[PDB]
Amino acid sequence: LTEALPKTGGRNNRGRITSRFIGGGHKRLYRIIDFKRRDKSGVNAKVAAIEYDPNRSARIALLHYADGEKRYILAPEGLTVGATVNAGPEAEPKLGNALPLRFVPVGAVVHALELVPGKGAQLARSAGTSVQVQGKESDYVIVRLPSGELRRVHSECYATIGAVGNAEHKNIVLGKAGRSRWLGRKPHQRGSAMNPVDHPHGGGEGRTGAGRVPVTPWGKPTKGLKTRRKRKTSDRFIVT
Amino acid sequence: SHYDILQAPVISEKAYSAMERGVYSFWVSPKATKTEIKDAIQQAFGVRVIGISTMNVPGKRKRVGRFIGQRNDRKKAIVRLAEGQSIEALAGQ
RNA sequence: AACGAUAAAAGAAGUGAGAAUCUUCUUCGCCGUAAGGACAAGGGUUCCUGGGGAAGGGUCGUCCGCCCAGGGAAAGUCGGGACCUAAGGUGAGGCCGAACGGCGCAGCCGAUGGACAGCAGGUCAAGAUUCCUGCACCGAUCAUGUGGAGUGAUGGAGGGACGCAUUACGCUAUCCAAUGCCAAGCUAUGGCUAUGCUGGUUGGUACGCUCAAGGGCGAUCGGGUCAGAAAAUCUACCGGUCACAUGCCUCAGACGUAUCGGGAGCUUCCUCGGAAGCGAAGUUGGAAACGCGACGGUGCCAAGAAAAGCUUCUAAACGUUGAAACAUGAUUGCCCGUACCGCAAACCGACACAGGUGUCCGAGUGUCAAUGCACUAAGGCGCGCGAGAGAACCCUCGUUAAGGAACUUUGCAAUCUCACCCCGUAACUUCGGAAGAAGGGGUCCCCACGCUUCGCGUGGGGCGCAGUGAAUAGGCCCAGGCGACUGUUUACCAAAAUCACAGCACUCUGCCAACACGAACAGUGGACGUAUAGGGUGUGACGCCUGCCCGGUGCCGGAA
RNA sequence: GAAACGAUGACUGAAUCCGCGCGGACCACCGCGCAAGGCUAAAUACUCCCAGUGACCGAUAGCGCAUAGUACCGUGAGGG
RNA sequence: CGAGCUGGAGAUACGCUUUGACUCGGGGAUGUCCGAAUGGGGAAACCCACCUCGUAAGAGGUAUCCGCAAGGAUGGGAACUCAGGGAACUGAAACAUCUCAGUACCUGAAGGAGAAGAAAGAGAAUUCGAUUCCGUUAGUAGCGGCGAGCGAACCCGGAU
Ligand SMILES: [Mg+2]
Ligand SMILES: [Mg+2]
Ligand SMILES: [Mg+2]
Ligand SMILES: [Mg+2]
Ligand SMILES: [Mg+2]
Ligand SMILES: [Mg+2]
Ligand SMILES: [Mg+2]
Ligand SMILES: [Mg+2]
């Protein structure tokens, strides 16, 4: 609703359908969100209003800084219009404050967590997601991620106080095909409804199934798709 | 130059009736422009042009001999002069 | 066999070697939300005139969209360009790759979008918002005066700038009525003698102490640098002062005066028919847009392009002795498009083909409404063989005694039913439905009385076999299978019980995500998303539920 | 293959003339030769074109064409 | 060259030519716009510019890659040449190594030719004396699911 960009639809890369499905949609505009917040250290901002944001799930908050620079931030669960928000290491454990993990107390619930100092927020961004802090190790802090995974994130990285907005994606029951169309194209086309050519679940005489695999080769219910990577050392306890 | 550009005068009955109103019509170089065409008439005939309207025109005959045919491609320029009209005497043709 | 829709055709006159077919006159009939009219695409001279008459034309041609020659096409303002950007294309530098090449920031190209100055008429045989007459407008260079000092970017900001449904007030295009006005005459068959009949009944521009719904708006001073790279007198933010109604600003349109125009028709000439000259009236009442006022109001979630033009700021620069802005004169006005066909005999369909083709306008009467249906204006057309006959049979129709499904694979087909108003209406239910359930009644004309109309209600009376009097116009019900539902499919034998679906589950994926395209340590999709997210696989609304077996196979896990 | 020798993508890596490489694993002897720099005419090949000739054709032959890559077909490549 | 000419053109009119037309042989001079295409754009043959000289007409320039600069490169060639990349039908009476074949095709570079070339060689006479080509050795030697089948070189004769 205030100084945004044009998000143009596209589901194919260099030419080909690369992410299966994906189509319809109500033609949305892009709102730039301050995911990092570092440069606004020390400066206080007023919550002008909580706006609607397609592209997200998390409600959007319009910040009116004292220096008159306007920015958008993911609205946390609780933040009301006419409240103050401050960025920088100097920050209270109050809603919407941006403060690095070292200054963040243990047992605290956070969202919009970084991964590398800078870049911007990368974890717990969608509505109702929380990061439970477990307690410091060195430069690194052990954190509980929305999945249940415990990661070693260095205290040098920012976070925002509280859980994400838009309360609950529950009473949202879609309703009918076509509600799903206001967003993404004729969903999941069963490979069992396909032909031998098209997919491995193709063919046979009637309704069936025989070895359980995806579109291309592989296998689908249980198969560690994660690789033998370096980011593994900075990670302790995964599953559930 | 001046003397080129205007290939020939428009014959017909409509041009000859326009002649009588101090309106002169010519077959000009297709590439020639309004400014260039106005200049050449103003010069070669010694008369001020108060207005120029112009437009391009195609071709395409054959009579016999399955010799495909071909266009010819012209441009016709029609000019109006102030009260001090007339071209040479080459108007009452 | 056929001569390409069952929308007809008749006679007269003409022309010519020759006439069902060409011209002309009078009729007839078909379309009329089109079978009329205006674009766009596309085609290319098919247009107009004069000639022709081999072949093309399903027949015939004297004719033609065919053949020959000549002509016709006119723009500062309409489309496009010399302006802008979207998807996409390209792309110095740059990132990759046996080669050829693939990617890619800015930038540039790219309308289907933004932006931007002209209207009313006239008329060639054939053009017209282009020519012509009338009176406007836009920008540029200079001149003469007003004026007296800034002007303000390749960068800042504002602004351009955007959805869907619904809806209040005002109006216009436009349409109706009349014993309003103006004009022409005459009518007689029985009557009317005009209060009958026909036709016309206002477009542009300028000004106006005239009416006017609607619509748009804050103005200023100051503070903080931590914001717009910097600067800013511009913008944002915070604070102070007057921000009810109002108050300013804007007039859609109406009215009036003027003026240019047009106007039914009349007047003369007539070389077979056109040219020229003249010109009346301009009422009251009713209806009324998808257009205009306008960026109105409300509601809603699926949350509704960009960039330039523009308006406001300073930087640098020239200049403050000739600034910007205004006013009036002159000058200037580039390139491409414009004929014609354009729901079609000129485009795509091998044909002058019963198909297909995007947008706009699309009158009247009747009928709740309407772009429906019937008839009909304007306009266009009778579909490029014809004439007899009145057999079998075949196609498309009308009626049908008595019976009424007995037909048959199957009521397939074809009837019945049919609109609006009133009464009335079941099991069953997700309490919405089922429902137009089922069933029954009314419907026309005249008069009188009442009211809320275009019309309606009550009373009495009339006519016919019959009153949605013709056209458009549900047959209904009981029980089951399957699939919850709307939707989607085999262009061209399958429309479904197929697929999809909302919902449920298993599962993988911690972000240079899994997964996918790829020559590639390129690049991109996933995603400018982040586990309330994304991939895969299955089941398939909702309700109650989903048991037993882990030997084989697969997946996750341990390791003597 | 008993597979020498050339060649090189990956890893390594020497000698310098009582020195190096070769002689079809490999050794010794006998013998042939000097890599890790570059050029180099002629003899060879082909025929768009030109001339000459022919137990080559003479209009369904000969080139697709007595000339046309036209007419015609196809969105196009192409075909003809 | 020495009288005709005015293209095919079967066509009339106007003319030209012994002060030597016409034609033929050899040079020049003009050569619109597109095309490597090269100012910028572009849907080839069209739009739109700027800079220098200039009385307007009009003339010249404005692409990237090499190098100081002179000067060179882009693009086109029927087949032939070398290079990078490289099929399958087919044979094997099936097929998989093998064959077809490093053929066809694509791509690069070039010329009238190219390629190759001046022995760390051939090779068994202590012969030879750069390369290419032709005959020959020779279907020998050998390779080979030892199958289908594939197939050298030295000597010698010869072109140069
Ligand atoms: Mg791009
Ligand atoms: Mg008949
Ligand atoms: Mg008889
Ligand atoms: Mg049953
Ligand atoms: Mg169904
Ligand atoms: Mg359905
Ligand atoms: Mg013969
Ligand atoms: Mg030829």
The CATH number of residue B24's host domain is: 3.30.70.330
Ligand 6 mean position, distance from CA A20 (Å): 27
Tokens of A61: 């908050």
Domain that holds residue B76: 1-93
Which pairing describes strands A131-136 and A84-86: parallel, antiparallel, or unpaired? unpaired
Q: Is A66 left (phi over 0), alpha (psi -120 to 50) or beta?
A: alpha
| PDB experimental method | X-ray
Structural domains in chain B (count)? 1
Query: Domains of chain A: which residue ranges?
Result: 1-86, 87-240
| Cβ-proximal residues to A123 (8 Å cutoff; 6+ apart), any chain | A112, A113, A114, A115, A131, A145, A146
| Cβ-proximal residues to B34 (8 Å cutoff; 6+ apart), any chain | B52, B54, B77
Which nucleotides of chain C are near protein (any atom < 7 Å from a CB)?
Answer: 44-45, 67-75, 86-88, 103-104, 124-126, 130-132, 158, 224-228, 235-238, 301-306, 333-338, 484-486, 498-503, 506-518, 522-540, 554-557
Ligand 2 mean position, distance from CA B39 (Å): 72
Specify the resolution in Å.
3.2
List the A140-144 sheet strands across, edge first: A150-154, A140-144, A131-136, A109-111, A160-161
The CATH number of domain A1-86, selected from 3.40.50.720, 3.40.50.300, 2.60.120.620, 2.40.50.140? 2.40.50.140
